[PDB]
Amino acid sequence: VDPRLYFENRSKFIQDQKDKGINPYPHKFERTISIPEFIEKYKDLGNGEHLEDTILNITGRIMRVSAQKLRFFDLVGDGEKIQVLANYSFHNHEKGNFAECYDKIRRGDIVGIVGFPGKSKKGELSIFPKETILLSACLHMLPMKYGLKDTEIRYRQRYLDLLINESSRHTFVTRTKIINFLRNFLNERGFFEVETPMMNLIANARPFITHHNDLDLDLYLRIATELPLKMLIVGGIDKVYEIGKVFRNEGIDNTHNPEFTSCEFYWAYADYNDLIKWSEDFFSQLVYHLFGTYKISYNKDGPENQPIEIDFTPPYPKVSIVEEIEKVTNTILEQPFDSNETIEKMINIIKEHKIELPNPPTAAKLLDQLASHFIENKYNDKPFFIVEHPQIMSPLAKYHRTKPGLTERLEMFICGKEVLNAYTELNDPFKQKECFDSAFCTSLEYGLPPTGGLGLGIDRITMFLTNKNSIKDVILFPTMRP
Amino acid sequence: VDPRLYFENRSKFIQDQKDKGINPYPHKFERTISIPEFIEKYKDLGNGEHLEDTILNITGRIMRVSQKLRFFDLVGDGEKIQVLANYSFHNHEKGNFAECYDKIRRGDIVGIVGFPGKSKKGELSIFPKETILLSACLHMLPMKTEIRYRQRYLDLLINESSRHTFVTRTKIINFLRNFLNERGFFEVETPMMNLIANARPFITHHNDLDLDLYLRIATELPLKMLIVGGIDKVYEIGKVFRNEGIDNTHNPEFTSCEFYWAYADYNDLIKWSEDFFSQLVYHLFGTYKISYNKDGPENQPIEIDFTPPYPKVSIVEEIEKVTNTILEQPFDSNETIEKMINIIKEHKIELPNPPTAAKLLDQLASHFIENKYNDKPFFIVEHPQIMSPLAKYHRTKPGLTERLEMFICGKEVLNAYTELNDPFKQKECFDSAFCTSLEYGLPPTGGLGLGIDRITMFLTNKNSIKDVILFPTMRP
Numbered sequence: 001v002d003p004r005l006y007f008e009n010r011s012k013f014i015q016d017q018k019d020k021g022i023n024p025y026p027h028k029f030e031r032t033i034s035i036p037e038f039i040e041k042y043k044d045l046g047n048g049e050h051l052e053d054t055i056l057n058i059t060g061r062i063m064r065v066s067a068q069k070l071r072f073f074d075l076v077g078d079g080e081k082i083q084v085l086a087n088y089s090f091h092n093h094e095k096g097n098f099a100e101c102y103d104k105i106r107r108g109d110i111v112g113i114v115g116f117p118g119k120s121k122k123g124e125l126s127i128f129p130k131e132t133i134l135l136s137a138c139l140h141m142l143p144m145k146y147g148l149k150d151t152e153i154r155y156r157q158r159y160l161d162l163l164i165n166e167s168s169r170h171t172f173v174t175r176t177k178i179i180n181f182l183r184n185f186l187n188e189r190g191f192f193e194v195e196t197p198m199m200n201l202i203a204n205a206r207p208f209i210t211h212h213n214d215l216d217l218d219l220y221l222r223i224a225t226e227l228p229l230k231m232l233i234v235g236g237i238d239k240v241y242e243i244g245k246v247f248r249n250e251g252i253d254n255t256h257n258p259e260f261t262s263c264e265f266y267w268a269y270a271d272y273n274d275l276i277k278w279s280e281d282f283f284s285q286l287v288y289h290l291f292g293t294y295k296i297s298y299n300k301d302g303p304e305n306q307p308i309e310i311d312f313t314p315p316y317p318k319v320s321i322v323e324e325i326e327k328v329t330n331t332i333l334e335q336p337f338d339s340n341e342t343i344e345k346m347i348n349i350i351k352e353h354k355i356e357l358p359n360p361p362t363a364a365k366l367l368d369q370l371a372s373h374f375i376e377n378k379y380n381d382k383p384f385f386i387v388e389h390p391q392i393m394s395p396l397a398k399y400h401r402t403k404p405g406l407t408e409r410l411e412m413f414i415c416g417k418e419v420l421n422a423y424t425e426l427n428d429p430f431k432q433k434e435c436f437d438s439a440f441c442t443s444l445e446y447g448l449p450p451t452g453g454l455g456l457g458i459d460r461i462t463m464f465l466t467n468k469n470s471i472k473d474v475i476l477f478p479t480m481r482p
Numbered sequence: 483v484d485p486r487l488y489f490e491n492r493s494k495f496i497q498d499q500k501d502k503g504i505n506p507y508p509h510k511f512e513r514t515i516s517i518p519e520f521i522e523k524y525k526d527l528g529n530g531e532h533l534e535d536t537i538l539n540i541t542g543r544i545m546r547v548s549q550k551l552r553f554f555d556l557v558g559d560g561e562k563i564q565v566l567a568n569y570s571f572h573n574h575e576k577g578n579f580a581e582c583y584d585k586i587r588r589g590d591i592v593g594i595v596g597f598p599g600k601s602k603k604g605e606l607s608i609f610p611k612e613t614i615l616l617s618a619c620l621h622m623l624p625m626k627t628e629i630r631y632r633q634r635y636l637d638l639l640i641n642e643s644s645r646h647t648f649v650t651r652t653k654i655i656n657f658l659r660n661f662l663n664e665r666g667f668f669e670v671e672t673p674m675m676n677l678i679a680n681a682r683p684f685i686t687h688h689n690d691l692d693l694d695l696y697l698r699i700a701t702e703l704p705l706k707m708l709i710v711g712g713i714d715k716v717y718e719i720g721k722v723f724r725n726e727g728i729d730n731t732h733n734p735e736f737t738s739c740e741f742y743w744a745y746a747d748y749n750d751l752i753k754w755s756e757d758f759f760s761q762l763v764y765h766l767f768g769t770y771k772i773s774y775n776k777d778g779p780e781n782q783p784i785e786i787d788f789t790p791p792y793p794k795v796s797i798v799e800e801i802e803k804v805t806n807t808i809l810e811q812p813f814d815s816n817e818t819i820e821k822m823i824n825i826i827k828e829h830k831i832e833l834p835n836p837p838t839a840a841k842l843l844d845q846l847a848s849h850f851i852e853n854k855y856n857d858k859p860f861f862i863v864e865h866p867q868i869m870s871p872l873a874k875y876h877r878t879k880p881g882l883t884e885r886l887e888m889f890i891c892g893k894e895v896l897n898a899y900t901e902l903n904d905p906f907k908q909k910e911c912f913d914s915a916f917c918t919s920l921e922y923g924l925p926p927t928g929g930l931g932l933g934i935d936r937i938t939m940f941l942t943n944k945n946s947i948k949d950v951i952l953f954p955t956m957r958p
């Protein structure tokens with residue numbers, strides 16, 4: 001049963017129909033209701049009951065074929081399934097022979113059916129055709145479920161995954177509902193959605209580089225939407241956001257894709273508490289909107305293993321990064337976190353605990369590194385915030401009001417993975433180090449109000465809410481090498 | 483009045499505030515009401531009426547400044563109230579009244595604690611007891627060039643119509659998303675980069691995969707694979723890229739909407755387009771008739787009527803009923819190409835680059851058809867297959883398709899067709915993944931694309947695409 005032979009026979013079948021005067025790709029079929037409408041309008045009749053008086057025009061993809069005068073098929077459309085019972089008695093022989101009409105049908109063929117609704121003797125909700133027409137033939141062989149488990153066919157040919165595995169469709173439906181909820185959530189709080197250029201002249205992480213033929217200039221794909229949105233705040237759009245793709249030309253892994261979907265907003269006059277409350281409201285309400293409860297289960301170590309429970313009931317713990325690193329390492333990090341003595345202490349903590357060195361070893365990255373190992377996995381039963389990051393890790397963040405060297409920064413984590421970043425912006429142009437992007441400093445001189453900004457990782461959030469371990473399982477067409 | 487000096491004086495003023503114990507960029511202000519809420523909650527208040535027992539914390543930007551009685555205009559979220567600073571209502575224990583208000587300049591962001599009222603002249607206003615600077619505008623704000631494009635925040639602060647233009651843009655996209663969702667369409671995202679991408683593409687180097695990728699020019703191919711996948715109504719709104727020449731109606735980065743609709747036919751796509759444009763314009767204007775300065779703000783405007791239905795003109799038939807010249811079936815024949823060139827030559831019409839049969843028919847349609855109906859939208863229909871190799875063949879007219887293209891004032895704004903789903907008629911199958919997916923079964927399907935930027939230009943009465951994009955790209 002070579003797949004190259006099945007295709008060649010089906011290909012010969014198609015030309016045979018054309019020679020015999022039959023179009024296997026007809027122009028138009030006049031559907032009257034969809035399968036989900038069908039299921040909802042006739043699910044509650046009796047076992048074996050027929051309403052032979054109403055005629056309907058249904059479409060769908062034949063998904064399983066079973067065989068003399070009785071023939072059964074499965075019919076799928078818009079994610080839902082009904083049975084097709086082909087009975088010799090109801091067949092309209094003016095249109096053709098019963099046997100050859102249904103013998104030509106293979107699993108995967110898309111068909112139009114003119115029939116009446118009913119329920120089977122065993123009791124299965126079914127459509128009772130009088131005529132069936134091939135609309136589009138499936139020339140290749142569709143696998144069963146097992147074929148798309150360990151192979152990366154799910155990613156190369158995502159349409160096979162969406163036809164064969166029911167979980168795949170639900171995943172990507174949940175993805176769309178997540179984004180719909182985010183947009184409606186933001187819009188109800190008076191936020192204004194905008195579009196910002198994806199190419200600019202100036203652009204942490206390596207950029208994607210491209211050239212514009214017209215202006216003979218090299219351009220950069222955006223790594224974030226921060227700068228243009230802050231200029232709109234100056235412009236008087238006091239609550240503004242954008243949902244869209246950003247690009248970081250770095251290495252692929254399970255939680256990093258070079259092209260990924262970000263939402264960022266800026267909120268004029270928001271303080272740290274406003275941002276904390278927004279995050280807790282958003283996540284707790286999003287999870288309730290999807291699941292009817294605040295508690296979900298997530299297979300933190302794959303489906304081969306027992307899942308853990310994550311509770312999204314607010315409030316969530318807040319952990320101060322510097323104070324907590326000191327707590328679990330019995331160390332006192334100094335006042336200048338970039339001081340040679342303070343660096344030295346941080347570097348020595350890495351070796352004693354045996355941690356991947358962060359060379360280029362920088363105060364920021366070691367701080368990051370320590371947090372990675374010492375704090376970022378502190379809780380897994382519930383989301384939590386790491387807060388009050390030092391000003392040396394957060395050059396754009398307003399300085400903490402009562403603690404020296406710190407900011408009003410917050411980062412929300414789920415199962416050890418960053419999902420949200422937010423802080424109050426440094427708006428004094430005389431205290432921003434960089435201004436001493438050049439458009440940003442000029443925009444600051446026109447007056448930026450006290451302002452809070454927040455960014456969300458849409459792909460990672462969808463990952464946890466659909467119980468997936470890889471970012472590739474929530475992107476329809478993850479980019480790959482041919 | 484050197485602008486460098488005004489800046490230098492105000493920056494010296496800032497450092498003078500700090501050296502005085504006053505922070506001109508304080509940490510936070512506890513705003514309790516926005517200006518639009520204030521305008522709405524107290525709109526129905528009598529002249530000279532005050533509510534002195536109600537304390538409010540309001541913010542905004544001073545846009546106008548005019549000894550013991552100070553008057554200011556305060557704007558926020560696009561709306562304005564007046565600030566009436568009376569010596570008697572100031573809290574003198576916080577500072578000298580004159581010292582506080584003499585520092586205020588146009589463009590300053592201020593936080594105010596005070597009570598609401600209307601002036602004896604009727605103007606709705608806030609009466610401060612305390613006014614605090616929240617962020618200084620160190621530069622001189624111009625009163626009402628290409629500065630509007632680079633520093634768009636200046637455009638949004640000084641021109642009221644600019645904010646309205648971009649509010650309408652967001653409103654248009656919102657209406658389209660809701661219009662699609664109510665009909666059962668499902669929004670998705672497809673890659674911005676791909677291995678195969680006519681039009682010149684943008685090229686970029688992927689570091690991790692050591693590959694050179696192409697920025698998408700359309701969303702058509704991945705969306706069609708989703709129809710195969712059983713997502714029968716699907717769409718995407720996002721950016722597509724054409725590495726080509728900038729024009730008043732062409733931007734290399736522009737916003738597209740494409741949907742695919744399994745089992746839709748020509749009539750469905752006609753009716754979708756006619757319902758969408760008419761209902762959208764009515765939703766925005768309360769009428770189907772708008773005015774548009776097609777010839778610039780100097781010249782007089784025309785009226786575009788969006789009352790459906792719109793006329794439909796068959797491209798090949800009409801080009802002969804005006805050129806009186808039959809175009810032989812193989813439109814790409816050397817003979818047919820030469821005859822089309824001859825019409826173009828005899829009418830002093832510019833030969834397109836390159837001189838291909840699809841290009842020539844485009845030129846002939848532009849000059850003999852596309853500007854016939856300009857007081858309402860219209861469709862050009864039944865384009866030859868040579869122009870739309872992905873479209874399905876016309877049911878009865880050989881060599882044609884069932885494609886529809888909608889024009890407004892001579893600019894294309896919408897393109898739709900039923901899809902060629904027989905893989906044995908796809909000449910392009912000699913993009914590799916798409917031919918394979920056609921062999922799994924693509925049902926009969928309608929596709930449709932929308933030019934969001936062009937639509938926004940007509941509905942906000944702009945002649946240039948740069949006026950409907952917040953930050954149009956430009957050389958520095």
Ligand SMILES: COc1ccccc1Nc1ncnc(Nc2ccccc2S(=O)(=O)C(C)C)n1
Nearest residue numbers: 248250251256257258260418419420455456457
């Ligand atoms: C080569 O890929 C990359 C290289 C470098 C950065 C990102 C990516 N791609 C990627 N893909 C999916 N999710 C994320 N999220 C993320 C990543 C880093 C820091 C914070 C977050 S986040 O989720 O808190 C949100 C607030 C952005 N990044």
Ligand SMILES: COc1ccccc1Nc1ncnc(Nc2ccccc2S(=O)(=O)C(C)C)n1
Nearest residue numbers: 724726727732733734736894895896931932933
């Ligand atoms: C250098 O810029 C370009 C180079 C080449 C192509 C496009 C652009 N940019 C651009 N900018 C704004 N609107 C459009 N739309 C458009 C353009 C041409 C024909 C039809 C349409 S359309 O609106 O019917 C839509 C359904 C495609 N294209």
